[PDB]
Prior knowledge:
The chain has helices at about 5-10, 15-25, 35-50, 65-70, 80-90, 105-110, 115-130, 135-150, 155-160, 165-190, 190-205, 210-230, 230-245, 260, 265-275, 285-290, 295-300, 305-315, 325-340, 345-350, 355-395, 400-415, 420-445, 450-460, 465-470, 500-515, 525-540, 550-560. Among the domains are: about 185-275, Orthogonal Bundle (Serum Albumin, Chain A, Domain 1); about 285-370, Orthogonal Bundle (Serum Albumin, Chain A, Domain 1), CATH 1.10.246.10. It is built from 28 helices and no strands. The chain starts with a helix and ends with a helix. It is globular. The longest helix has about 40 residues, at about 355-395. By secondary structure, it is mainly α. It comes from Homo sapiens (Human). Belongs to the ALB/AFP/VDB family.
Amino acid sequence: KSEVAHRFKDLGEENFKALVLIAFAQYLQQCPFEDHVKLVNEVTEFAKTCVADESAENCDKSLHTLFGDKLCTVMADCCKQEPERNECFLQHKDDNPNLPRLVDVMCTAFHDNEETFLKKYLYEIARRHPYFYAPELLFFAKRYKAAFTECCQADKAACLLPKLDELRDEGKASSAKQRLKCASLQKFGERAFKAWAVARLSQRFPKAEFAEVSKLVTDLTKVHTECCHGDLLECADDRADLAKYICENQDSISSKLKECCEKPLLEKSHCIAEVENDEMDLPSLAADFVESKDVCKNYAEAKDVFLGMFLYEYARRHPDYSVVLLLRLAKTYETTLEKCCAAADPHECYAKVFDEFKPLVEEPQNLIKQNCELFEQLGEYKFQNALLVRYTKKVPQVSTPTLVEVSRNLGKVGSKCCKHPEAKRMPCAEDYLSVVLNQLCVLHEKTPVSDRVTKCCTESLVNRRPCFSALEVDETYVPKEFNAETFTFHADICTLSEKERQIKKQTALVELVKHKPKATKEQLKAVMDDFAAFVEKCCKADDKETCFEEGKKLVAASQAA
């Protein structure tokens, strides 16, 4: 009885009220910080009475009832009964909240109140990332404190920032990768997430057999179902159970995790999550899945088991393949079996399934090869502008900030993965590609404006990237005329850093392409540099922001091109 006392004893108090603070902030993202900490205090106070005795007044209540009840003491449409009032809080999670505020003298605030500083960090991140992996957010919290426990007491802004530039970089990656996990579980189903897990684990532990891989998949599926559904306490508990289930059966999984298990709890599960693939002779995979005469009857007797074995055996031999490609081949193998098993001569039909896999393998290899060549031709900034143009052409109805954020992240994928050896570059490039594309989909789903985005985002998870790749120019889009909210500049841009000055210039490039999505050539190259020189000139000028006159001036010169 009393699930709150179960999780309080299993997780401890410190991790308890931190996870409870992440949950309320991800549900009600617009409430002030000091209102949540008081709710956490009253919830943590009630939990200790249930730890004192599991059968008090309301201990036996669900965690949905306990959390939902006091979520509503201070959206009021939802606060209906529990089998429904909890779902109402879920579909109101805002992936793009109207929040704006995301300095070595702030390091003072750390030393004035180390605790409130760290918990306000959890509050600000969780409310802007309502699907953040909460057990992993505790890890960034410890790493946040850890960094401040080293460089905040000679040259502060020299030890802090190189670590406060790697953590936040991992933070954006962590929230985006987890957002894809939640989308696959909630939009595409448990079967889709388990298929992704089977391929991911088979690549990672190719020495582990189909039993333990299937075992770890089932546990991993329950972990992320709870977290994405808002069951943060059970999710952190089960994540600790699974991380400790490994290590105890390490040699039956992979001989490469030993230096991760002597590590503390939050860093050991983060270690196992960031472990690289184990070491990869096996029989020909065509024998059991292609050339055997019993392929159709084995497939019909146990469909998902047969498909899982195929994905496990294929992924265990191809760590050079992306996970999304392996899922793509498994989908093709399923579709081919469905068609040829029902045909006249099935054996001669599905015996060609490896020939149709050939273009599906070469397509991402060619795409990454060409775009990494384009990256090395332009550098990251110009590669971002090239992708900016490319994607505003595909889907010009998408909001300009969304197109700028997606295209800039696509450029970051090139800077990171194109330097890798080809034996690990496609897993990097293509799987991060699906992560960034999922960002576009969830941001567009909040305010759908383009049926082309909607179709590619809802067609199929594995065909998402090929769907977007096939787009070129939206031939039905009517050009947008320039307005006041679109094109005005002033001299406040010169006080900006080098990064947000480029983002401003990249914001205007999107509006350029929206003004005429057919222009392209490198006619857009001339305009983008006409705007660049326009900013450099008026920033170094001798005036009172009266230069930024030249606005109506060179804009017309770009209507000439």
